[PDB]
Paper text:
Laccases (E.C. 1.10.3.2) possess a great biotechnological potential due to their ability to oxidize a wide range of phenolic substrates, spanning from small toxic phenols to large biopolymers such as lignocellulose. Like other multicopper oxidases, laccases operate via catalytic Cu-centers and coupling of the oxidative reaction to reductive cleavage of atmospheric oxygen into water. The overall fold of the three domain laccases consists of three cupredoxin-like domains with the catalytic copper sites located at domain 3 (C) and the trinuclear copper centre located at the interfaces between domain 1 (A) and 3 (C). The catalytic centres comprise three distinct types of copper ions classified by their spectroscopic properties, an electron shuttling Type 1 Cu (T1), and a trinuclear copper cluster (TNC) formed by a mononuclear Type 2 Cu and a binuclear Type 3 Cu site.
With the aim of elucidating the structure and function of asco-laccases, we have undertaken the structure determination of the asco-laccase from the thermophilic fungus Myceliophthora thermophila (MtL), The structure is known of four other asco-laccases (AA1_3): MaL from Melanocarpus albomyces, TaL from Thielavia arenaria, BaL from Botrytis aclada and AnL from Aspergillus niger. MtL crystallizes in space group C2221 with one molecule per asymmetric unit. In the crystal, N-linked glycosylation could be seen at seven out of ten consensus sites (N-x-T/S). Additional difference electron density was interpreted as two Ca2+ ions originating from the crystallization conditions. One of these (CA605) is directly involved in crystal packing mediating contacts between two symmetry related molecules as it coordinates to Asp530 and Asp534 in one molecule and the carbonyl oxygen of Val341 in another molecule. The MtL structure contains three fully occupied copper ions in the TNC-site. The site was modelled as a classical resting state with oxidized Cu ions, a hydroxide ion bridging the T3-coppers and a water/hydroxide ion coordinated to the T2-Cu, as this appeared to be the major component present. In the MtL structure, the T1-pocket is devoid of any ligands, buffer components or cryo reagents. The MtL protomers are related by a twofold crystallographic symmetry axis parallel to b, show significant shape complementarity and a larger buried surface area than the MaL and TaL dimers, but similar to the BaL dimer. The regions forming the dimer interface have low sequence conservation. It is interesting that the interface contains most of the loops that creates the T1-pocket of the MtL structure, which is sealed by the dimer formation, allowing access only via a conserved narrow solvent channel.
Numbering used by the authors: 2 to 559
Write the structure that this text describes.
């Protein structure tokens, strides 16, 4: 029986609460949550701001798919039906650690082959051994930029009481060009501005006024949970609610001790759960997106993207207080979040070495102009020959573009200094994302404006003081600063092939990623006959389909 109430959100059930180590213990509900998702391709689709898009790719006929709802401890089973015309697809459950279920991670070329179009299907099955807000999206090149996105809401305890859960609130850049058109563009030009920003799938057009603002209703006097998600392909957002603060209670899938802020930076793929108290004069208030960092991590052709938060009982119409711009967040996420379930990372004798350093670089000396590399190699996988097929067939002859980084030893700690192109003339902020794990942010280069051109190259002597293992930020996306660095660590507790990549679609398309091959021998030993059978069958189906495809693979595949 549940003990989770508005006044006691910390409690879940007997023996299970906000302090439970959810990486060890989850309720055994015995419950399965089956879902079916169907992808379709639509030409000349009238979008939410009135502009007709040449082509979109939708989950259940929307550019935001159905939300995957579950409770902590449930089993989730998602049948994905690919009714696109030519593209394969693979659906990644972003933020779900897939503990012991690597082959359900949905990373084509890594953990599976793509699902063939015109009716291909597969069933993903995984456990809700975490709770909080996540999202799902295609990993088939930049396909999710066409609309193959949705939210995940796994209910469980929380670090603050609240009366009402308002639900998921995904915010996304929106382009009139297709994802494939934008990959082609960004091979030889920088990232463009978004045409608009959609809040829960809607917005007004900045010139015509067609469309509608998202409209979120607050109950006067009450505390409301809002589940923010940046589902963009490139835009990084600063969000703020006029005349209201937001109290953070979770970052990505990790509950944190409450932190009240006036505005919030959401990198691509980041989530924040916040509590908003409706304690102001009843009215209508803008929920604004703004951009900082010299627009180096996004801008939009809509100068004032916004939603409306409406107090129940107040008048209708638009807010009248335009509010003030928030502080410039410098394309940086919060460095001081504190997980409720605290952990210490050993930091005794850490030093920079070839085997714990990964340099992100941009190579502009060839064709295409923008080639992204990690440790000197642009990632490039073969959709028909996924990493885990090499592991299972005991083939160690990975192509160089697979960017395999071996991580061995059960329960080892794996440390990584990520450097942003030391010495380069121009660098960009990067939202770095690890599959299969939360990582720990041990430190990063001093906060700067990314437009300041102030360089920081990690100096092991000088910069040890910037590193700490005392309950570090723990999450699954964090920012690599322009002209700087970040040190990350994770525990080798999950045998699998795990992508680690920049979540800007143009960058991972263009080569910015590696594959952590974690405990490969253990992975081979743990993969069930059923998982191996399903891998092999889908890969056979994909390989039979691929030569009939009218289009080439245009990029890394990721
Ligand atoms: C963006 O657009 C999307 C799409 O239109 C919007 O999605 C909607 O989001 C709603 C909020 O998540 C969601 O409502 C939920 O729907 C499901 C039905 O499938 C239902 O389970 C939920 O019902 C709960 O919440 C309502 C209040 O809304 C309660 O009246 C109700 O009794 C349920 O309360 C229980 O669950 C809550 C968490 O969901 C708890 O906060 C609550 O305390 C209570 O939990 C206790 O009881 C449980 C059972 O006894 C127990 O397990 C637990 O431990 C506790 O003891 C709710 O109605 C819509 O379904 C969803 N619509 C779609 C189409 O997806 C979204 O809102 C938009 N975003 C914004 C910001 O506007
Ligand atoms: C996302 O969208 C999909 C649709 O694209 C939703 O799934 C559909 O759900 C509706 C109900 O909401 C169903 O509509 C009914 O269909 C009845 C006939 O169903 C049989 O025939 C279908 C056509 O051949 C066939 O697809 C279907 O198979 C499905 O269910 C079987 C039973 O579990 C299973 O063997 C298959 O895996 C397959 O999933 C049946 O054999 C009809 O009599 C009713 O009048 C009504 O129209 C659809 O059948 C569903 N389609 C599919 C493919 O599942 C899905 O719920 C949406 N998801 C969310 C989260 O909203
Ligand atoms: C956002 O959604 C809310 C619903 O949650 C809308 O609020 C509703 O707004 C209408 C007016 O647009 C209110 O009705 C009005 O009431 C007055 C007095 O009773 C009456 O004189 C008017 O003729 C009209 O009927 C309604 O009360 C209100 N509902 C709630 C629960 O507050 C709001 O309009 C939406 N905003 C936008 C921009 O769409
Ligand atoms: C939060 O979002 C809202 C909604 O987009 C922003 O409101 C907009 O603010 C701009 C800037 O002042 C307004 O433009 C001005 O319009 C007037 C009237 O046409 C004109 O005289 C000025 O020269 C200027 O163009 C705009 O009208 C207004 N939009 C709406 C619908 O009211 C708000 O500024 C945002 N706040 C923050 C802090 O970003
Ligand atoms: C996935 O489907 C899209 C949409 O049809 C394909 O996109 C086209 O790709 C060609 C070749 O690069 C371009 O000339 C077109 O401009 C693209 N069209 C649109 C609307 O974007 C894409 O090639 C497909 N990918 C695969 C691997 O099949
Ligand atoms: C970086 O690449 C070199 C080969 O160019 C390789 O020897 C080294 O092991 C790589 N480092 C990592 C961490 O993968
Ligand atoms: C192992 O992989 C390499 C590279 O993809 C391939 O050329 C070779 O044929 C594979 N070996 C076997 C036995 O399949
Ligand atoms: Ca260079
Ligand atoms: Ca078999
Ligand atoms: Cu993701
Ligand atoms: Cu992910
Ligand atoms: Cu990047
Ligand atoms: Cu990914
Ligand atoms: O991802």
């Amino acid at each position: 029986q549940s003990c989770n109430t508005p006044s006691n959100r910390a409690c879940w059930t007997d023996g299970y609460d906000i302090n439970t180590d959810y990486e060890v213990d989850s309720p055994d509900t015995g419950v399965v949550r089956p879902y079916t998702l169907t992808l379709t391709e639509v030409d000349n689709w009238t979008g939410p701001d009135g502009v007709v898009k040449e082509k979109v790719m939708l989950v259940n006929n929307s550019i935001i798919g159905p939300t995957i709802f579950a409770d902590w401890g449930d089993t989730i089973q998602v049948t994905v039906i690919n009714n696109l015309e030519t593209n394969g697809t693979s659906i990644h459950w972003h933020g779900l650690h897939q503990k012991g279920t690597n082959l359900h991670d949905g990373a084509n070329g890594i953990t599976e082959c793509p699902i063939p179009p015109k009716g291909g299907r597969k069933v993903y099955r995984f456990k809700a051994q975490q709770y909080g807000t996540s999202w799902y999206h295609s990993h088939f090149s930049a396909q999710y930029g066409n609309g193959v996105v949705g939210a995940i809401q796994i209910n469980g305890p929380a670090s603050l009481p609240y009366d009402t859960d308002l639900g998921v609130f995904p915010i996304s850049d929106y382009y009139y060009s297709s994802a494939d058109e934008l990959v082609e563009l960004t091979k030889n030009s920088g990232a463009p501005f978004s045409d608009n920003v959609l809040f829960n799938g809607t917005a007004k057009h900045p010139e015509t006024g067609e469309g509608e603002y998202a409209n979120v209703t607050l109950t006067p006097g009450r505390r409301h949970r809002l589940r923010l998600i940046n589902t963009s392909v490139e835009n990084h957002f600063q969000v703020s609610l006029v005349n209201h603060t937001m109290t953070i209670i979770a970052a990505d899938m990790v509950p944190v001790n409450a932190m009240t802020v006036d505005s919030l930076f959401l990198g691509v793929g980041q989530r924040y759960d916040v509590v908003i108290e409706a304690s102001r004069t009843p009215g209508n208030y803008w929920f604004n997106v703004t951009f900082g960092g010299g627009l180096l991590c996004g801008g939009s052709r809509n100068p004032y993207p916004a939603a409306i938060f409406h107090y129940a009982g107040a008048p209708g119409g638009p807010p009248t207080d335009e509010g003030k711009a928030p502080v410039d967040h410098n394309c940086l996420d919060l460095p001081n979040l504190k997980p409720v379930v605290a952990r210490d990372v050993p930091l005794s004798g850490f030093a920079k070495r070839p085997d714990n350093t990964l340099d992100v670089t941009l190579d502009t000396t060839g064709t295409p102009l923008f080639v992204w590399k990690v440790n000197g190699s642009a990632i490039n996988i073969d959709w028909g020959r996924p990493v885990v097929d090499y592991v299972l067939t005991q083939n160690t002859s990975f192509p160089p573009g697979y960017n395999i980084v071996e991580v061995n030893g059960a329960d080892q700690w794996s440390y990584w200094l990520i450097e942003n192109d030391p010495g380069a003339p121009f660098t960009l902020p990067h939202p770095m994302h690890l599959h299969g794990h939360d990582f720990y942010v041990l430190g990063r280069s001093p906060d700067e404006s990314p437009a300041s051109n102030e360089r920081h190259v990690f100096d092991p002597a000088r910069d040890a003081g910037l590193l700490s293992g005392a309950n570090p930020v723990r999450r699954d996306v964090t920012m690599l600063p322009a002209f700087g660095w970040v040190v990350l660590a994770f525990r080798a507790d999950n045998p699998g092939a795990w992508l680690f990549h920049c979540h800007i679609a143009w960058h991972v398309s263009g080569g910015l990623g590696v594959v952590y091959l974690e405990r490969a021998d253990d992975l081979r030993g743990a993969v069930s006959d059923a998982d191996a059978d399903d891998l092999d069958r889908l890969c056979a189906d994909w390989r039979r389909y691929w030569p009939t495809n009218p289009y080439p693979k245009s990029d890394s595949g990721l």
